[PDB]
Every structure is written in C-alpha cells, then in structure tokens.
Symmetry: C2
C-alpha cells in the first residue's frame, strides 16, 4: 500500500518479484503434445483412482485436444475473428511461434506450435490458474523442446 | 532437463516454481492513470534510468507519455466496441470481487504495454515496459495492481 495515487504508480515501477505473488493454483491439470494436423495426442501427462476413469480421462483429453486444435487452426488462418484470448508472437533461439489461450468451459488452456513443426504443446489448467502465468510457463517450457523444432509427421 | 517427452510433460504438471523464473526485465518504464474518455493523463510515474532528472528532459518525456497515452486510449476504445478488428495482442476478462474489467495488451513499436479500465470508472490504468518485459507478467501485475484501486472504482469525470 501507499499514501496516494502518485505513490502507488511509483511503486508499480519497482522490480516485480514474481516471488511475492500468491496464486490460488500454479499447477496444471494436463499437459500434452498433439499433432497440428489433426489434434491427435502423441504424448500426455495428467494429474487427473480406477480403470474406467483412466480410460475416460484419456478419452476426455482426446476430445479437448481436438477442440483446441480446431480453434488454433482457425485462428492461424486469420480470415475470421479470433477464438483466442491472446496471440503473443515469441522467439526461442530465433525460432518463431505464437502463444494462444483458450477458455474451455471453466478451464484455462494455453497452446503453442513447437516452432516449424507439425506439433503443438498444450497446457490445461483450472480457471484459477492465471493466463499470464500459463503464457510465461509455455514460453519457457518450449525452450526444452529444441529436438522437436521442425518435426514433420510426413 | 528430463529424459524424454513423457517426463518433460510430467514435469510441467508440478507447481510452477516462481523462484526459478528469471526475467531480463521486470521493471516498468512508466505507469499512469489516464481518462477513458480522452486518454488525458491524470497521474503518472516514470523511471529515471536514461537521462538526468532535469528540465528539458522532464518536459520532453511528459510530452511523449501524453502522445503514447493518447494512441493507446484510441486503440483501447476501438477494441472495446467491436469483435473482429482487434488492435490488442490479448483481451482477458477479469473479476475483482464482483467488479469486472478487461486487460488488453498492445505492442507499441518495441515497447510492451498493458491497459485495463478501472472498473465502472472513467479511468484506465496503463503500464509501459520495454519489449523484454513479458506480456504474461504485465497481465498478472496489472490484475493485482487493480485490486489496490477500489477507491477509484466507479470514478466519474466532471
């Protein structure tokens, strides 16, 4: 806190330690790599007890992945209005991609093409996980995936 | 690091350790409250890193801030009353308590900027930062900052 509006604005200029920032949730629900061509899951992890729920959970991820890939591909051919909440152009080692965000019912999702590839990296989180954090997260995580830059399904 | 793609994905599920996330830039260049009607600056602060705090410099930088505030307000206004023709890089509807607003981000030459209407008011909160200040961080920051400005919710000019 501060005395007045001027002092508040001066305080906003100080270095913003993401340290002092509390989040309701900062963990993902699910994370996967899917094809940019058809939204098929090539690899996934989830946080979310029995056999049918393991099966069901993969089925639900497949449906979600398909929906998200459709919105991503529509947004990429920018001849219509954007489904996405955000489109941030980014560079990892001079490889370019774009970070999109999609609301899916109560969930926050974030997706980016692995640069030059036929693959998307997709994060799925509860609605309490801020989009700003997802965007930071996905850009950093993408740096780990240089092996897959340019990956072609062929 | 990790062993394979599966392990990489599993690692992304863990609580995002903020204590490890380094940024090139996490300080704003400038911060202001401007009118949603005309983009007129009502209060501002700017960092003193470039030139000495003197006279000509002060006059010049305020003039620049006024020009930028106007351009950004115009972009915001246009975005607020349409669907498909968005200038902004993002638009996040947020709720503070039961009040609603929207966080917009704009590329301004090499600068990253972030703006949100102070809920139910004639005022906008505007952040200006260098291009190395990630938009995701600006969005987090302005939502949190907006929580401190309840005194100004419902503020009307006149």
């Amino acid at each position: 806190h501060s005395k007045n509006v001027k002092g508040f604005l001066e305080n906003t200029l100080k270095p913003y330690d993401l340290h002092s920032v509390d989040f309701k949730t900062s963990s993902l629900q699910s994370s996967m790599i899917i094809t940019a061509t058809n939204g098929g899951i090539l690899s996934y992890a989830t946080s979310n007890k029995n056999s049918i729920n393991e099966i069901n959970s993969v089925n639900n991820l497949k449906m979600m992945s398909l929906l998200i890939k459709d919105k991503w591909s529509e947004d990429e051919n920018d001849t219509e209005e954007q489904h996405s909440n955000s489109c941030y152009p980014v560079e990892i080692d001079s490889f370019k991609t774009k970070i999109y965000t999609y609301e899916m019912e109560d969930l926050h999702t974030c997706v980016a093409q692995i640069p030059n590839s036929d693959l998307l990296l997709l994060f799925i989180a509860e609605g309490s996980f801020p989009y700003g954090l997802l965007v930071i997260k996905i850009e950093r995580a993408m740096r780990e995936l240089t092996d897959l830059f340019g990956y072609k399904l062929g």
